Amino acid sequence: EFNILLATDSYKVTHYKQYPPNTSKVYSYFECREKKYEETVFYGLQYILNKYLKGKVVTKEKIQEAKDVYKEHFQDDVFNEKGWNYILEKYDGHLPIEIKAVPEGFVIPRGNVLFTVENTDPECYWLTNWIETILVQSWYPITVATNSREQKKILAKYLLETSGNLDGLEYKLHDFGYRGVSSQETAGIGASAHLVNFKGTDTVAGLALIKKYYGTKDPVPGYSVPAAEHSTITAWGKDHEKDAFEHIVTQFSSVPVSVVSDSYDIYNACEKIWGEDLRHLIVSRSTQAPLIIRPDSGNPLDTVLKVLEILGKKFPVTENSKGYKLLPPYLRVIQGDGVDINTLQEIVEGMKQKMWSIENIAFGSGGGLLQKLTRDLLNCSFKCSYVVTNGLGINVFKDPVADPNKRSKKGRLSLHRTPAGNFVTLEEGKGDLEEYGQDLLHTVFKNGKVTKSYSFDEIRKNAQLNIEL
Amino acid sequence: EFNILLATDSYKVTHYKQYPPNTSKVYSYFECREKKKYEETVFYGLQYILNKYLKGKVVTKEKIQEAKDVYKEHFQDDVFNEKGWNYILEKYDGHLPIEIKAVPEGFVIPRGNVLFTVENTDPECYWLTNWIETILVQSWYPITVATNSREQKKILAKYLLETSGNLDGLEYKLHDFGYRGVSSQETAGIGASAHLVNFKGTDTVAGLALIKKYYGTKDPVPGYSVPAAEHSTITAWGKDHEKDAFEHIVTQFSSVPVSVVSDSYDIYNACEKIWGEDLRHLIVSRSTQAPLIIRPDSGNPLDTVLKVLEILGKKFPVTENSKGYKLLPPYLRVIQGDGVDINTLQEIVEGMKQKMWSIENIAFGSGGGLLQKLTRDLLNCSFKCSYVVTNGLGINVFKDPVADPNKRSKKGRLSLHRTPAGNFVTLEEGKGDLEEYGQDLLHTVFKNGKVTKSYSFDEIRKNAQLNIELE
Ligand SMILES: O=C(NCc1ccc(S(=O)(=O)c2cccc(C(F)(F)F)c2)cc1)c1cnc2n[nH]cc2c1
Ligand SMILES: O=C(NCc1ccc(S(=O)(=O)c2cccc(C(F)(F)F)c2)cc1)c1cnc2n[nH]cc2c1
């Protein structure tokens, strides 16, 4: 079972001994440091607060366990047993910490304070940065949500341009990343972050995360439809690809169905199998139940364009009010190979150049959506800015000579609206001067309790694109 | 509680309706597909997955109903195979009728070889083999962490041996700083455990408990750390009192090794004036078993390491070792823990060698580069069906996409063997049955809900040793 005394970087076990004597306060903050990705979606802290930080997180057993582990890990006794016991005895093991944060779903420019952390008991000065490691993991849902939203912006631009509206936008980028992430827990967190922006997911783990920690009015936040994989095609034998196709589309005759078509020869499959042999089974389908053809190999742009050209000669294509080509409503394409933010952009621009509407296509993204991301992308960072020692408050910061980009903010921080309606972070307690109105951070955690929270429905609202608004 | 019925890709819920009728067996395999460097991979991590997620009673009435309810809304349709899951519950008390055979954990195997196979043991459960693709394929992560970590050990070993004449301290030269930089607590434990296959230094505490619970070691713990500052414990003293912070910290930890980040304001000043003059007397008095380890944390990693060494070499008594390389006094060492991945690690040690500094002088910390900056595409980790039985006839199956030969999959029943020259070969089409190639290196590790063969972390470390270490 999870032990918060074992959920920090090893060296922080030794930090209580290193602060100035008589330090009563350590105040720290998190930002996506400024140096693409000019704004970030703040999402995922609520999960962390609830799963890991709230309530009785310290017990006698947990203290003894950490002591026993650290004795061996350090080959020495450096663990702060006394400090953790104080929390257990004084607060029934509830963390005497206060955290303030911007609302989940908020879209905030880089280099602003997103959350702050401080101890509420002078004895627990060391506690603020003990929990740095767990809190900093919020980088992941923030970065997934942010990158997913940037992709939605691209899709919106091109869908709007080639079709004249945004119908179907929230189903244009589907999460295929379950197998390509590093763990079950990561799958749930990452999938939920993608769902801030879209409604299509195969990463089932995200649904229960959202239900437990955020909630939606709707029964579920994300959806899928039947689809083949290579095994359900290839199992029929190399000479029976047509039979597999026919069986699958007949099994799923009245719901949407996606069929991967590149097991042997994508171009043959589109031109001869779907386009001729089984055409009669496709042109009969409901607009509510298209066949969605899936290529899965080759150059992503070149393959998409060739697949569309093939289908456009076998099926009745129309020209929409914008002058772009549209497959008939019972036939669509999904490209779910090699898709990341860069290749997504190359594909939609390439389709636009060849006069194909973005209405024709959806994208699936796995590793690119959920795994190919690091803390460096948005420079997510947690730093101490204020301490009280001998009763005196001091504004503190790092400012490395060789890299101004790593300079941290000083003193007590607050978030405000500027006269033009943008965000500004005020340093050095200047928020107290009340020249910039009220602090936009809310207390979300205090003394073991979650004090403010957001539904997944409100997070989605906060995260909307300007174009959608 | 974890629900295996909710731990697959959505579309796999619909696959039981798509296989050929009269199919009794689906047999699938996992490989790190050969591309067109990472020419060999460390197989590690399956044992964790088997124990945490696959073994024992994993199906219950409540879990089946839960899945039914979720999928009804997720698909806006009733597609879920309730009958198939009920069958497993009734006939096998909720244990998976699956057999998995795998190469021993720790084994180092060239790309394009079978690492494990999966098949159903009951004809009714043909659909189950690929249901669990999603959870099994996540083994890509500990494989890739272990492999990339080992490739870094090879670079360190080559340069340590060249500049010092031996491998002393190699197992402590790449420390895991990745706890905060990975995507979740679970990922942290798994990734940290995989790094420990190759090294002994970690700050990612989560790895220790995973190893104890799922693998085990003779020693109390698999990994170690030592006291160290962070920017907060320096900056809290105030900009004008960096020296006071340094003095306080090395005095607190005067008898153990201690690392002190030195770039809060001016790394070069800190080394030349603070460590090299003001506080020199507190450094030169230290034990060889308790050095000060100076940590820069910004600037160009190579340029900064070299300049730091340049500065320290002029303030402290440096010797020339028997290989002609410069060596800091035993009480003074350096760790570079910013911007390190396999590429920059290589650039740093080669740069050090060019400037005649022994690799003895330095250690590396890696966080995101070590544990997060990896994907399934690095080693092309992939799970594919190679054999099915339909109407009682076995057929060898595969994909072979016209526009990408690299994605062609293997055919039929597979086995892994030693070649006459002592290398590895995967035999396809059941050809291992001909017995021309000695015994199958795959062992049954899971069968019908039970883990049937396990490895200790000690055995895994042994299997994953570098050739240079063996020699
Ligand atoms: O095809 C897969 N999953 C099913 C699937 C997902 C997404 C689509 S879609 O065309 O975007 C689509 C169409 C209509 C409704 C929805 C809706 F509204 F439901 F979202 C989604 C169609 C089918 C699939 C394929 N390959 C994969 N690799 N790894 C995971 C994978 C998942
Ligand atoms: O300094 C940090 N951790 C403590 C630490 C780790 C590793 C070393 S080391 O020089 O490799 C070393 C020296 C002697 C023994 C060991 C031994 F045998 F114990 F492994 C390790 C010295 C100190 C640290 C620094 N920055 C970080 N960012 N994110 C996580 C971080 C952790």
Numbering used by the authors:
A (entry chain B): 8 to 42, 53 to 486
B (entry chain A): 8 to 43, 53 to 487
What does the report in the manuscript say about this coordinate set?
NAMPT functions as a homo-dimeric enzyme that catalyzes the rate limiting step in the primary salvage pathway for NAD synthesis, the transfer of a phosphoribosyl residue from 5-phosphoribosyl-1-pyrophosphate (PRPP) to nicotinamide (NAM) to produce nicotinamide mononucleotide (NMN). Crystal structures of NAMPT in numerous ligand-bound forms have been reported. These structures consistently display a NAMPT homo-dimer with two essentially identical active sites at the dimer interface. Typical NAMPT inhibitors were found to occupy the portion of active site responsible for NAM binding and a tunnel-shaped cavity extending from the NAM binding site. Furthermore, we determine the crystal structures of six NAMPT mutants in the apo form and in complex with various inhibitors and present a definitive model to explain the differential effects of the mutations on various structural classes of NAMPT inhibitors.
GNE-618 is a novel small molecule that potently inhibits NAMPT activity and exhibits efficacy in xenograft models of cancer. H191 and G217 together with D219 and Y188 form one side of the tunnel wall surrounding the cavity commonly occupied by NAMPT inhibitors. This proximity suggests that these mutations could directly interfere with GNE-618 binding. The H191 imidazole ring forms a herringbone stacking interaction with the GNE-618 phenyl linker moiety. The same interaction is observed for other bi-aryl sulfone inhibitors. The stacking interaction defined the orientation of the inhibitor linker moiety inside the tunnel passage and oriented the inhibitor's terminal group to exit the tunnel. The optimal orientation of H191 imidazole ring is facilitated by hydrogen bond interactions with D219 and a water molecule (WAT), which in turn interacts with the main chain carbonyl of Y188.
